[PDB]
Design a protein around this motif. Structure first.
Motif, mmCIF file in Angstrom:
data_model
loop_
_atom_site.group_PDB
_atom_site.id
_atom_site.type_symbol
_atom_site.label_atom_id
_atom_site.label_comp_id
_atom_site.label_asym_id
_atom_site.label_seq_id
_atom_site.Cartn_x
_atom_site.Cartn_y
_atom_site.Cartn_z
ATOM 1 N N UNK A 283 40.675 38.753 47.388
ATOM 2 C CA UNK A 283 41.297 38.772 48.743
ATOM 3 C C UNK A 283 40.382 39.608 49.686
ATOM 4 N N UNK A 284 39.384 38.962 50.286
ATOM 5 C CA UNK A 284 38.388 39.760 51.061
ATOM 6 C C UNK A 284 39.021 40.567 52.176
ATOM 7 N N UNK A 285 38.596 41.825 52.280
ATOM 8 C CA UNK A 285 39.040 42.735 53.323
ATOM 9 C C UNK A 285 40.345 43.419 52.981
ATOM 10 N N UNK A 286 40.888 43.173 51.786
ATOM 11 C CA UNK A 286 42.227 43.668 51.472
ATOM 12 C C UNK A 286 42.191 45.117 50.989
ATOM 13 N N UNK A 287 43.391 45.692 50.899
ATOM 14 C CA UNK A 287 43.625 47.006 50.358
ATOM 15 C C UNK A 287 44.472 46.884 49.109
ATOM 16 N N UNK A 288 44.692 48.011 48.476
ATOM 17 C CA UNK A 288 45.420 48.148 47.214
ATOM 18 C C UNK A 288 46.270 49.422 47.302
ATOM 19 N N UNK B 123 47.060 41.259 50.104
ATOM 20 C CA UNK B 123 46.369 41.735 51.307
ATOM 21 C C UNK B 123 46.454 43.244 51.497
ATOM 22 N N UNK B 124 47.620 43.845 51.223
ATOM 23 C CA UNK B 124 47.770 45.284 51.329
ATOM 24 C C UNK B 124 48.025 46.042 50.049
ATOM 25 N N UNK C 4 47.845 50.912 44.293
ATOM 26 C CA UNK C 4 46.880 51.373 43.300
ATOM 27 C C UNK C 4 47.095 50.718 41.938
ATOM 28 N N UNK C 5 47.215 49.391 41.954
ATOM 29 C CA UNK C 5 47.445 48.615 40.730
ATOM 30 C C UNK C 5 46.729 47.279 40.781
ATOM 31 N N UNK C 6 46.347 46.778 39.586
ATOM 32 C CA UNK C 6 45.972 45.347 39.574
ATOM 33 C C UNK C 6 47.205 44.476 39.845
ATOM 34 N N UNK C 7 47.031 43.410 40.618
ATOM 35 C CA UNK C 7 48.136 42.511 40.887
ATOM 36 C C UNK C 7 48.773 41.965 39.615
#
Ligand SMILES: [Br-]
Ligand SMILES: [Br-]
Ligand SMILES: [Br-]
Ligand SMILES: [Br-]
Ligand SMILES: [Br-]
Ligand SMILES: [Br-]
Ligand SMILES: [Br-]
Ligand SMILES: [Br-]
Ligand SMILES: [Br-]
Ligand SMILES: [Br-]
Ligand SMILES: [Br-]
Ligand SMILES: [Br-]
Ligand SMILES: [Br-]
Ligand SMILES: [Br-]
Ligand SMILES: [Br-]
Ligand SMILES: [Br-]
Ligand code: NA
Ligand SMILES: [Pt+2]
Ligand SMILES: [Pt+2]
Ligand SMILES: [Pt+2]
Length: 129
Positions: free
Chosen positions: A69-74, A61-62, A77-80
């Motif tokens: 994950x609609x509306x989420x942030x990163x 989510x963050x 700055x990485x792929x999960x």
């Protein structure tokens, strides 16, 4: 990768987590135990549609991008997927941002409920550190 307890303590210390934001190594090891049972490949789907990834169960989510994950942030700055690596660098770097967010290690619900206020030094007892 499934880390041993003292193996993970050593890696976490190498990467600068011991006393990071005032949290002793035992806190971090305890968190990883209850979050992932020390398995870097651990994933858990949440009711909100986000997913938790890796040894510290960092959430989409963050903190990372998983594309689903609609509306989420990163904010890390990485792929999960980076959080599932046998190399814990991405998880440690991201955990440092999380624990600096304002609520400390309360960001990890399992830490609050199972580690906070306990004898966390038990998690590093015996380890060559
Ligand atoms: Br253990
Ligand atoms: Br061990
Ligand atoms: Br090491
Ligand atoms: Br390092
Ligand atoms: Br570093
Ligand atoms: Br550091
Ligand atoms: Br400790
Ligand atoms: Br969060
Ligand atoms: Br997304
Ligand atoms: Br999406
Ligand atoms: Br972002
Ligand atoms: Br990314
Ligand atoms: Br590592
Ligand atoms: Br690191
Ligand atoms: Br990274
Ligand atoms: Br704090
Ligand atoms: Na995200
Ligand atoms: Pt590092
Ligand atoms: Pt650092
Ligand atoms: Pt490492």
């Amino acid at each position: 990768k499934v880390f041993g307890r003292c193996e993970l303590a050593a890696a976490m210390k190498r990467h600068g987590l011991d006393n990071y934001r005032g949290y002793s190594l035992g806190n971090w090891v305890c968190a990883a135990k209850f979050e992932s049972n020390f398995n870097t490949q651990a994933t858990n789907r949440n009711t909100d549609g986000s997913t938790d990834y890796g040894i510290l169960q960092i959430n989409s989510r963050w903190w990372c991008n998983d594309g689903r994950t609609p509306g989420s942030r990163n904010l890390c700055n990485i792929p999960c997927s980076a959080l599932l690596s046998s190399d814990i660098t991405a998880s440690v770097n991201c955990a440092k941002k999380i624990v600096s967010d304002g609520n400390g290690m309360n960001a990890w619900v399992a830490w609050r409920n199972r580690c906070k206020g306990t004898d966390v030094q038990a998690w590093i007892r015996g380890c060559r550190l």
